[PDB]
Amino acid sequence: QMQNRKEEIQILEMEAQAAARLRQVMELREKEDRQRMVRMDMDIHRQQ
């Protein structure tokens, strides 16, 4: 199982790296949608 551990660990640690980036990814994807909404609200100010 040292061989199966070798494989499992690399499987997992690589995913951990994905998680390690995705945390930041979600924030900026959130930013994009929240800001997209904000733009629309300033457009309303322009409609006024």
Short mmCIF file of all heavy atoms in Angstrom, two decimals, unseen atoms left out:
data_model
loop_
_atom_site.label_atom_id
_atom_site.label_comp_id
_atom_site.label_asym_id
_atom_site.label_seq_id
_atom_site.Cartn_x
_atom_site.Cartn_y
_atom_site.Cartn_z
N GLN A 1 0.82 -1.16 0.00
CA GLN A 1 0.00 0.00 0.00
C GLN A 1 0.85 1.21 0.00
O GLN A 1 0.34 2.31 -0.04
CB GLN A 1 -0.96 0.04 1.17
N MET A 2 2.16 1.06 0.04
CA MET A 2 2.94 2.25 -0.06
C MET A 2 2.77 2.74 -1.47
O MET A 2 2.90 3.94 -1.71
CB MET A 2 4.39 2.01 0.26
N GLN A 3 2.47 1.84 -2.42
CA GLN A 3 2.33 2.25 -3.80
C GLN A 3 0.97 2.84 -4.00
O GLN A 3 0.81 3.83 -4.71
CB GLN A 3 2.49 1.04 -4.70
N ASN A 4 0.01 2.28 -3.31
CA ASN A 4 -1.32 2.82 -3.43
C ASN A 4 -1.42 4.13 -2.67
O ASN A 4 -2.19 5.00 -3.06
CB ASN A 4 -2.32 1.79 -3.01
N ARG A 5 -0.62 4.30 -1.60
CA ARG A 5 -0.57 5.56 -0.89
C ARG A 5 0.12 6.55 -1.78
O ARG A 5 -0.34 7.67 -1.94
CB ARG A 5 0.23 5.52 0.40
N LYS A 6 1.20 6.15 -2.44
CA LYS A 6 1.87 7.10 -3.29
C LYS A 6 0.88 7.65 -4.31
O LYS A 6 0.80 8.87 -4.50
CB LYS A 6 3.04 6.41 -4.01
N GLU A 7 0.09 6.76 -4.92
CA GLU A 7 -0.85 7.26 -5.88
C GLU A 7 -1.96 8.06 -5.21
O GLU A 7 -2.32 9.13 -5.69
CB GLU A 7 -1.48 6.16 -6.70
N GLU A 8 -2.48 7.61 -4.09
CA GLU A 8 -3.60 8.34 -3.54
C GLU A 8 -3.19 9.70 -3.08
O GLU A 8 -3.94 10.67 -3.22
CB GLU A 8 -4.22 7.60 -2.38
N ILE A 9 -2.01 9.81 -2.52
CA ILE A 9 -1.58 11.08 -2.02
C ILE A 9 -1.43 12.02 -3.18
O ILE A 9 -1.91 13.14 -3.11
CB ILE A 9 -0.29 10.95 -1.21
N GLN A 10 -0.83 11.60 -4.28
CA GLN A 10 -0.74 12.61 -5.33
C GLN A 10 -2.11 12.97 -5.88
O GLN A 10 -2.36 14.13 -6.20
CB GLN A 10 0.20 12.19 -6.45
N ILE A 11 -3.05 12.04 -5.86
CA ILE A 11 -4.36 12.39 -6.35
C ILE A 11 -4.95 13.50 -5.49
O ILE A 11 -5.46 14.49 -6.00
CB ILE A 11 -5.30 11.16 -6.29
N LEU A 12 -4.86 13.30 -4.18
CA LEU A 12 -5.41 14.23 -3.22
C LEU A 12 -4.72 15.54 -3.11
O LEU A 12 -5.36 16.58 -2.94
CB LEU A 12 -5.28 13.64 -1.85
N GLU A 13 -3.41 15.53 -3.16
CA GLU A 13 -2.72 16.77 -2.96
C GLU A 13 -2.94 17.63 -4.18
O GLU A 13 -3.03 18.86 -4.06
CB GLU A 13 -1.28 16.50 -2.62
N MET A 14 -3.03 17.03 -5.36
CA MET A 14 -3.31 17.83 -6.51
C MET A 14 -4.67 18.46 -6.36
O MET A 14 -4.82 19.66 -6.59
CB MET A 14 -3.21 17.01 -7.76
N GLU A 15 -5.65 17.72 -5.90
CA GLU A 15 -6.92 18.37 -5.75
C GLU A 15 -6.83 19.48 -4.75
O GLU A 15 -7.40 20.56 -4.96
CB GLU A 15 -7.99 17.47 -5.29
N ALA A 16 -6.07 19.28 -3.68
CA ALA A 16 -5.97 20.30 -2.68
C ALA A 16 -5.47 21.57 -3.32
O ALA A 16 -5.90 22.65 -2.93
CB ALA A 16 -5.05 19.89 -1.56
N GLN A 17 -4.58 21.45 -4.31
CA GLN A 17 -4.12 22.62 -5.01
C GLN A 17 -5.26 23.25 -5.75
O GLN A 17 -5.30 24.47 -5.91
CB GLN A 17 -3.03 22.32 -6.02
N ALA A 18 -6.17 22.46 -6.27
CA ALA A 18 -7.26 23.10 -6.96
C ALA A 18 -8.08 23.89 -5.95
O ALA A 18 -8.38 25.06 -6.16
CB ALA A 18 -8.13 22.09 -7.66
N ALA A 19 -8.31 23.31 -4.78
CA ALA A 19 -9.10 23.98 -3.76
C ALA A 19 -8.40 25.26 -3.32
O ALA A 19 -9.03 26.31 -3.08
CB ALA A 19 -9.31 23.06 -2.58
N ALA A 20 -7.08 25.19 -3.30
CA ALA A 20 -6.17 26.24 -2.91
C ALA A 20 -6.28 27.47 -3.80
O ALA A 20 -5.76 28.54 -3.45
CB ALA A 20 -4.75 25.71 -2.96
N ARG A 21 -6.80 27.29 -5.01
CA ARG A 21 -6.93 28.39 -5.92
C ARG A 21 -8.38 28.78 -6.03
O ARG A 21 -8.71 29.97 -6.07
CB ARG A 21 -6.38 28.04 -7.28
N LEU A 22 -9.27 27.78 -5.96
CA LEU A 22 -10.69 27.96 -6.16
C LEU A 22 -11.28 28.88 -5.13
O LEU A 22 -12.19 29.64 -5.40
CB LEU A 22 -11.38 26.61 -6.21
N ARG A 23 -10.69 28.89 -3.95
CA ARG A 23 -11.16 29.82 -2.95
C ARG A 23 -11.06 31.26 -3.46
O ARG A 23 -11.92 32.08 -3.15
CB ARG A 23 -10.30 29.77 -1.75
N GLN A 24 -10.02 31.58 -4.24
CA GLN A 24 -9.85 32.94 -4.73
C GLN A 24 -10.67 33.13 -5.96
O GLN A 24 -11.18 34.22 -6.24
CB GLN A 24 -8.40 33.23 -5.07
N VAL A 25 -10.82 32.05 -6.69
CA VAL A 25 -11.59 32.07 -7.91
C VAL A 25 -13.02 32.41 -7.61
O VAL A 25 -13.63 33.22 -8.30
CB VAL A 25 -11.51 30.71 -8.56
N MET A 26 -13.59 31.81 -6.57
CA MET A 26 -14.96 32.12 -6.26
C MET A 26 -15.14 33.55 -5.91
O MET A 26 -16.18 34.13 -6.23
CB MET A 26 -15.48 31.31 -5.11
N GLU A 27 -14.17 34.15 -5.25
CA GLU A 27 -14.33 35.52 -4.86
C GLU A 27 -14.36 36.41 -6.04
O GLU A 27 -15.17 37.33 -6.12
CB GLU A 27 -13.18 35.98 -3.99
N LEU A 28 -13.54 36.14 -7.02
CA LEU A 28 -13.59 37.08 -8.09
C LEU A 28 -14.70 36.75 -9.06
O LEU A 28 -15.18 37.66 -9.74
CB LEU A 28 -12.21 37.25 -8.67
N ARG A 29 -15.19 35.52 -9.08
CA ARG A 29 -16.35 35.27 -9.91
C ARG A 29 -17.55 35.97 -9.26
O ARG A 29 -18.41 36.53 -9.94
CB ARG A 29 -16.61 33.79 -10.06
N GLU A 30 -17.59 35.96 -7.92
CA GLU A 30 -18.63 36.65 -7.20
C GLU A 30 -18.56 38.11 -7.51
O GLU A 30 -19.56 38.74 -7.82
CB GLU A 30 -18.48 36.48 -5.69
N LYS A 31 -17.34 38.66 -7.51
CA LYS A 31 -17.15 40.06 -7.80
C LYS A 31 -17.72 40.39 -9.12
O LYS A 31 -18.39 41.41 -9.27
CB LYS A 31 -15.68 40.42 -7.86
N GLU A 32 -17.46 39.55 -10.10
CA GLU A 32 -17.98 39.87 -11.38
C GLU A 32 -19.48 39.93 -11.35
O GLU A 32 -20.04 40.93 -11.76
CB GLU A 32 -17.50 38.85 -12.40
N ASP A 33 -20.16 39.01 -10.70
CA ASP A 33 -21.60 39.16 -10.78
C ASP A 33 -22.15 40.23 -9.90
O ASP A 33 -23.12 40.91 -10.29
CB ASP A 33 -22.30 37.85 -10.54
N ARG A 34 -21.54 40.47 -8.77
CA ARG A 34 -22.06 41.51 -7.95
C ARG A 34 -21.84 42.84 -8.64
O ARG A 34 -22.72 43.69 -8.63
CB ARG A 34 -21.42 41.51 -6.60
N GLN A 35 -20.67 43.03 -9.23
CA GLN A 35 -20.37 44.28 -9.88
C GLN A 35 -21.25 44.45 -11.10
O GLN A 35 -21.67 45.56 -11.42
CB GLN A 35 -18.92 44.35 -10.28
N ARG A 36 -21.55 43.34 -11.80
CA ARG A 36 -22.39 43.42 -12.98
C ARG A 36 -23.74 44.01 -12.59
O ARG A 36 -24.28 44.87 -13.29
CB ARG A 36 -22.59 42.03 -13.57
N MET A 37 -24.24 43.60 -11.43
CA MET A 37 -25.45 44.15 -10.86
C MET A 37 -25.30 45.64 -10.50
O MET A 37 -26.15 46.46 -10.83
CB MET A 37 -25.82 43.32 -9.65
N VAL A 38 -24.17 45.99 -9.93
CA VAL A 38 -23.94 47.37 -9.55
C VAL A 38 -23.99 48.28 -10.74
O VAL A 38 -24.50 49.41 -10.64
CB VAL A 38 -22.60 47.53 -8.87
N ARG A 39 -23.46 47.84 -11.85
CA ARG A 39 -23.46 48.62 -13.06
C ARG A 39 -24.90 48.94 -13.47
O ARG A 39 -25.22 50.09 -13.18
CB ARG A 39 -22.63 47.94 -14.12
N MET A 40 -25.76 47.95 -13.15
CA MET A 40 -27.08 48.02 -13.73
C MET A 40 -27.80 49.07 -12.89
O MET A 40 -28.66 49.81 -13.37
CB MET A 40 -27.84 46.71 -13.63
N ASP A 41 -27.39 49.15 -11.63
CA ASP A 41 -28.01 50.08 -10.68
C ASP A 41 -27.60 51.52 -10.97
O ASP A 41 -28.36 52.46 -10.74
CB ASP A 41 -27.54 49.74 -9.30
N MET A 42 -26.39 51.70 -11.47
CA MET A 42 -25.97 53.03 -11.81
C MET A 42 -26.66 53.40 -13.10
O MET A 42 -27.01 54.56 -13.32
CB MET A 42 -24.47 53.11 -11.89
N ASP A 43 -26.98 52.39 -13.92
CA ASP A 43 -27.72 52.67 -15.13
C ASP A 43 -29.09 53.18 -14.73
O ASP A 43 -29.60 54.11 -15.35
CB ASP A 43 -27.88 51.46 -16.03
N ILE A 44 -29.63 52.66 -13.64
CA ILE A 44 -30.92 53.14 -13.19
C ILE A 44 -30.75 54.59 -12.78
O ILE A 44 -31.57 55.43 -13.14
CB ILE A 44 -31.49 52.41 -11.99
N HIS A 45 -29.66 54.92 -12.10
CA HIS A 45 -29.46 56.32 -11.74
C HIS A 45 -29.46 57.17 -13.01
O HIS A 45 -30.03 58.27 -13.03
CB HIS A 45 -28.14 56.54 -10.98
N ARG A 46 -28.88 56.66 -14.08
CA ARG A 46 -28.87 57.40 -15.33
C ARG A 46 -30.30 57.49 -15.92
O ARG A 46 -30.63 58.46 -16.59
CB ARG A 46 -27.90 56.82 -16.34
N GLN A 47 -31.12 56.46 -15.70
CA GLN A 47 -32.50 56.47 -16.19
C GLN A 47 -33.27 57.55 -15.44
O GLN A 47 -34.12 58.22 -16.01
CB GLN A 47 -33.18 55.13 -15.96
N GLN A 48 -32.95 57.75 -14.18
CA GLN A 48 -33.61 58.80 -13.42
C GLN A 48 -33.24 60.12 -14.05
O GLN A 48 -34.07 61.03 -14.16
CB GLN A 48 -33.20 58.74 -11.96
#
